[PDB]
Design a protein around this motif. Sequence first.
Motif, mmCIF file in Angstrom:
data_model
loop_
_atom_site.group_PDB
_atom_site.id
_atom_site.type_symbol
_atom_site.label_atom_id
_atom_site.label_comp_id
_atom_site.label_asym_id
_atom_site.label_seq_id
_atom_site.Cartn_x
_atom_site.Cartn_y
_atom_site.Cartn_z
ATOM 1 N N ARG A 73 -2.906 -23.519 63.852
ATOM 2 C CA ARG A 73 -2.271 -23.654 62.539
ATOM 3 C C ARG A 73 -3.297 -24.086 61.479
ATOM 4 N NH1 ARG A 73 3.231 -27.071 62.084
ATOM 5 N NH2 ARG A 73 3.716 -25.162 63.271
ATOM 6 N N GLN A 74 -4.064 -25.127 61.789
ATOM 7 C CA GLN A 74 -5.139 -25.604 60.920
ATOM 8 C C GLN A 74 -6.100 -24.482 60.578
ATOM 9 O OE1 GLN A 74 -7.099 -29.019 62.548
ATOM 10 N NE2 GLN A 74 -5.252 -30.299 62.478
ATOM 11 N N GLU A 75 -6.432 -23.668 61.574
ATOM 12 C CA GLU A 75 -7.380 -22.586 61.360
ATOM 13 C C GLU A 75 -6.809 -21.489 60.444
ATOM 14 O OE1 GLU A 75 -10.528 -22.594 62.022
ATOM 15 O OE2 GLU A 75 -10.402 -24.569 62.950
ATOM 16 N N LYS A 76 -5.502 -21.260 60.538
ATOM 17 C CA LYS A 76 -4.832 -20.283 59.689
ATOM 18 C C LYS A 76 -4.889 -20.735 58.232
ATOM 19 C CE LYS A 76 -2.106 -17.003 58.119
ATOM 20 N NZ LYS A 76 -2.628 -15.614 57.907
ATOM 21 N N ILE A 77 -4.633 -22.014 58.005
ATOM 22 C CA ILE A 77 -4.670 -22.562 56.652
ATOM 23 C C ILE A 77 -6.080 -22.487 56.039
ATOM 24 C CG2 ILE A 77 -4.174 -24.552 55.194
ATOM 25 C CD1 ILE A 77 -2.156 -25.419 57.291
ATOM 26 N N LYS A 78 -7.094 -22.808 56.841
ATOM 27 C CA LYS A 78 -8.471 -22.745 56.367
ATOM 28 C C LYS A 78 -8.874 -21.308 56.032
ATOM 29 C CE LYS A 78 -10.554 -25.175 59.627
ATOM 30 N NZ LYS A 78 -11.014 -26.311 60.495
ATOM 31 N N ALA A 79 -8.505 -20.350 56.892
ATOM 32 C CA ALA A 79 -8.841 -18.944 56.645
ATOM 33 C C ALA A 79 -8.149 -18.424 55.384
ATOM 34 C CB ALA A 79 -8.493 -18.052 57.856
ATOM 35 N N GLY A 125 -10.905 -16.856 43.652
ATOM 36 C CA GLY A 125 -11.850 -17.790 43.073
ATOM 37 C C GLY A 125 -11.416 -19.216 43.321
ATOM 38 N N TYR A 126 -12.389 -20.092 43.508
ATOM 39 C CA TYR A 126 -12.109 -21.470 43.874
ATOM 40 C C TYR A 126 -11.320 -22.175 42.800
ATOM 41 C CZ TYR A 126 -12.763 -26.429 44.932
ATOM 42 O OH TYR A 126 -12.544 -27.752 45.212
ATOM 43 N N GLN A 127 -11.699 -21.951 41.545
ATOM 44 C CA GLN A 127 -11.093 -22.672 40.424
ATOM 45 C C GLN A 127 -9.699 -22.123 40.137
ATOM 46 O OE1 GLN A 127 -12.002 -25.367 39.033
ATOM 47 N NE2 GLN A 127 -14.094 -25.608 39.825
ATOM 48 N N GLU A 128 -9.549 -20.816 40.318
ATOM 49 C CA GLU A 128 -8.294 -20.131 40.047
ATOM 50 C C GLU A 128 -7.248 -20.479 41.089
ATOM 51 O OE1 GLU A 128 -11.526 -18.069 38.002
ATOM 52 O OE2 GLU A 128 -9.651 -19.149 37.612
ATOM 53 N N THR A 129 -7.705 -20.676 42.318
ATOM 54 C CA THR A 129 -6.833 -20.961 43.451
ATOM 55 C C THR A 129 -6.317 -22.391 43.401
ATOM 56 O OG1 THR A 129 -8.054 -19.370 44.880
ATOM 57 C CG2 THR A 129 -6.727 -21.074 46.008
ATOM 58 N N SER A 130 -5.027 -22.572 43.642
ATOM 59 C CA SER A 130 -4.427 -23.906 43.733
ATOM 60 C C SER A 130 -3.927 -24.184 45.153
ATOM 61 C CB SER A 130 -3.226 -24.006 42.785
ATOM 62 O OG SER A 130 -2.210 -23.093 43.187
ATOM 63 N N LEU A 131 -3.641 -25.445 45.436
ATOM 64 C CA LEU A 131 -3.126 -25.815 46.744
ATOM 65 C C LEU A 131 -1.865 -25.021 47.063
ATOM 66 C CD1 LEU A 131 -3.210 -27.496 49.275
ATOM 67 C CD2 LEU A 131 -1.932 -29.278 48.059
ATOM 68 N N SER A 132 -0.994 -24.886 46.061
ATOM 69 C CA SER A 132 0.287 -24.206 46.226
ATOM 70 C C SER A 132 0.099 -22.709 46.490
ATOM 71 C CB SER A 132 1.200 -24.444 45.009
ATOM 72 O OG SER A 132 0.897 -23.568 43.932
ATOM 73 N N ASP A 133 -1.000 -22.149 45.989
ATOM 74 C CA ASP A 133 -1.379 -20.785 46.363
ATOM 75 C C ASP A 133 -1.637 -20.710 47.871
ATOM 76 O OD1 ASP A 133 -1.246 -19.666 43.837
ATOM 77 O OD2 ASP A 133 -3.387 -19.970 43.401
ATOM 78 N N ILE A 134 -2.267 -21.756 48.408
ATOM 79 C CA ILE A 134 -2.688 -21.802 49.807
ATOM 80 C C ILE A 134 -1.491 -22.061 50.722
ATOM 81 C CG2 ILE A 134 -4.023 -23.091 51.514
ATOM 82 C CD1 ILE A 134 -6.033 -23.650 49.080
ATOM 83 N N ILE A 135 -0.667 -23.030 50.347
ATOM 84 C CA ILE A 135 0.612 -23.263 51.008
ATOM 85 C C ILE A 135 1.460 -21.997 50.982
ATOM 86 C CG2 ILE A 135 2.786 -24.508 50.903
ATOM 87 C CD1 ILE A 135 1.289 -26.863 49.696
ATOM 88 N N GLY A 188 -3.966 -33.275 57.212
ATOM 89 C CA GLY A 188 -4.985 -34.066 56.549
ATOM 90 C C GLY A 188 -5.490 -33.192 55.417
ATOM 91 N N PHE A 189 -4.961 -31.972 55.385
ATOM 92 C CA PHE A 189 -5.262 -30.998 54.345
ATOM 93 C C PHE A 189 -4.463 -31.318 53.084
ATOM 94 C CE2 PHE A 189 -7.446 -29.401 57.644
ATOM 95 C CZ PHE A 189 -6.976 -28.323 58.372
ATOM 96 N N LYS A 190 -4.717 -32.486 52.500
ATOM 97 C CA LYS A 190 -3.904 -32.998 51.396
ATOM 98 C C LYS A 190 -4.248 -32.393 50.035
ATOM 99 C CE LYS A 190 -1.581 -35.749 54.053
ATOM 100 N NZ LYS A 190 -1.601 -37.225 53.873
ATOM 101 N N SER A 191 -5.257 -31.526 50.002
ATOM 102 C CA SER A 191 -5.717 -30.959 48.738
ATOM 103 C C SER A 191 -6.585 -29.713 48.902
ATOM 104 C CB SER A 191 -6.488 -32.011 47.939
ATOM 105 O OG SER A 191 -7.715 -32.336 48.575
ATOM 106 N N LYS A 192 -6.820 -29.033 47.785
ATOM 107 C CA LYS A 192 -7.675 -27.854 47.755
ATOM 108 C C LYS A 192 -9.120 -28.228 48.080
ATOM 109 C CE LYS A 192 -9.151 -26.051 43.951
ATOM 110 N NZ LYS A 192 -9.090 -25.416 42.619
ATOM 111 N N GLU A 193 -9.550 -29.377 47.569
ATOM 112 C CA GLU A 193 -10.894 -29.865 47.809
ATOM 113 C C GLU A 193 -11.076 -30.277 49.264
ATOM 114 O OE1 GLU A 193 -9.130 -30.973 45.025
ATOM 115 O OE2 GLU A 193 -10.237 -29.756 43.580
ATOM 116 N N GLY A 194 -10.069 -30.939 49.824
ATOM 117 C CA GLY A 194 -10.132 -31.364 51.209
ATOM 118 C C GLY A 194 -10.289 -30.170 52.128
ATOM 119 N N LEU A 195 -9.563 -29.101 51.835
ATOM 120 C CA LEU A 195 -9.662 -27.891 52.626
ATOM 121 C C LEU A 195 -11.047 -27.274 52.491
ATOM 122 C CD1 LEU A 195 -6.100 -26.379 52.122
ATOM 123 C CD2 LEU A 195 -7.148 -27.000 54.337
ATOM 124 N N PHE A 196 -11.538 -27.144 51.258
ATOM 125 C CA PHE A 196 -12.889 -26.650 51.098
ATOM 126 C C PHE A 196 -13.844 -27.419 52.019
ATOM 127 C CE2 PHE A 196 -17.113 -26.988 49.068
ATOM 128 C CZ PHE A 196 -17.504 -25.672 49.212
#
Lengths: 200, 200
Positions: free
Chosen positions: B9-15, B25-35, B48-56
């Motif tokens: 699951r963690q790996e799916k979120i990171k990918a 784009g990093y700046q264009e992308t939001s956490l909610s885009d990723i969720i 522990g993936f509490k943010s876009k930065e944390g995931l990066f």
Amino acid sequence: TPSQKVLARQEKIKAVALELFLTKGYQETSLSDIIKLSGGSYSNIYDGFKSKEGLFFEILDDICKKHFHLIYSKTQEIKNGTLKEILTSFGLAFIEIFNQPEAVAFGKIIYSQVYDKDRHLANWIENNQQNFSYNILMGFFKQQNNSYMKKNAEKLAVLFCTMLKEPYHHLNVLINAPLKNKKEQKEHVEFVVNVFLNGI
Amino acid sequence: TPSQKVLARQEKIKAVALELFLTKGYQETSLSDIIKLSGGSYSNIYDGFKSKEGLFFEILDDICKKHFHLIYSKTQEIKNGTLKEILTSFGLAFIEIFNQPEAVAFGKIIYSQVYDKDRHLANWIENNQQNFSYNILMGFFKQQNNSYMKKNAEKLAVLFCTMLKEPYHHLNVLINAPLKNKKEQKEHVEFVVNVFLNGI
Ligand SMILES: C[C@@H](CCC(=O)NCCS(=O)(=O)O)[C@H]1CC[C@H]2[C@@H]3[C@H](O)C[C@H]4C[C@@H](O)CC[C@]4(C)[C@H]3C[C@H](O)[C@]12C
Ligand SMILES: C[C@@H](CCC(=O)NCCS(=O)(=O)O)[C@H]1CC[C@H]2[C@@H]3[C@H](O)C[C@H]4C[C@@H](O)CC[C@]4(C)[C@H]3C[C@H](O)[C@]12C
């Protein structure tokens, strides 16, 4: 003279731009913020100051020229000129310049532009190559009666500046790591000059 | 196993995070885009993936570990081990890694964070010092039966990596300067190894 008033006006706009950058922040500050506190000392027409980025790079123009002549002077104070002491005089002046808060503040502004689609930075660097300090060292390397040093002169200039600057500047900029005090500067330059001249 | 599904699951979120970073784009992308495109493969709670930065930086975790073991392997292939050929094996692998488009893309993301007030970057670098490749070189320098090399080991490690990396990476990142092809890589490593070992 009209020409002197023109230049005084340009300087007022740049100082206002810089003051905003430092207090309000580069990203927070807009062109209209700068026009605003420049007053009618800026009439929208005659300028080459067509943007916030253009102004930043006009400010950088001056700073680069200032640093170049300062390093050049300190270096040409030595007439005797062993390679070791010319390296060391260039090193001390160069590293001191990079260990001022200003160098870090400007560094951050430049880094923040990484996704700028206007490519002000690339144009600036390409149009100002001759004004970078590494040219000073490049000139000495040429004068050295050495096949290897004349032919690689630019790359050696760039190698030396890099060994001095990085990764310390990068860390000052990215995570606000502490600057080197005068003693550490001196130590690093000497450390680097030895490796460069004599290898490990 | 539950633990394996957790990791899948963690790996799916990171990918998903990475794919967005690269396309949108990093700046264009939001956490909610990723969720959003992670679907219910992410339930907001256990992460522990509490943010876009944390995931990066979780993605960067893996990449750093991967590069470390790759450089370490290429380096430990040599058993004979002259300092010159260990430097050269480290150099070739290191510089190749920095001359991939990926290195530049990640570089830009990091630079763009220069004004982040959350200090993810500083925490990351401070918590992962042991995972940087310069440690590999640092270990060899220690093993060298040399007073100078053991005592300065870290600084020499960092000096060598810098001479290799900069200012080339900086320019790839800031103005998208061209990468070095394989031949130029080889040439630069050898150029640098000579200056480092033997001085000019
Ligand atoms: C990108 C950096 C690389 C240095 C460089 O341009 N070398 C050219 C190498 S090459 O032969 O063309 O390959 C330099 C070039 C111009 C530099 C910036 C300008 O120097 C801005 C200044 C402010 C000054 O005190 C100098 C440092 C600095 C705060 C710089 C930091 C920065 O890392 C820059 C952008
Ligand atoms: C900031 C850079 C400085 C290198 C470093 O951390 N050295 C430590 C010196 S010291 O003893 O602590 O003084 C490094 C550290 C971590 C680096 C980034 C991480 O390495 C991110 C990677 C992706 C990888 O392929 C490695 C290069 C890179 C794309 C990096 C580019 C970048 O310039 C960073 C941020």
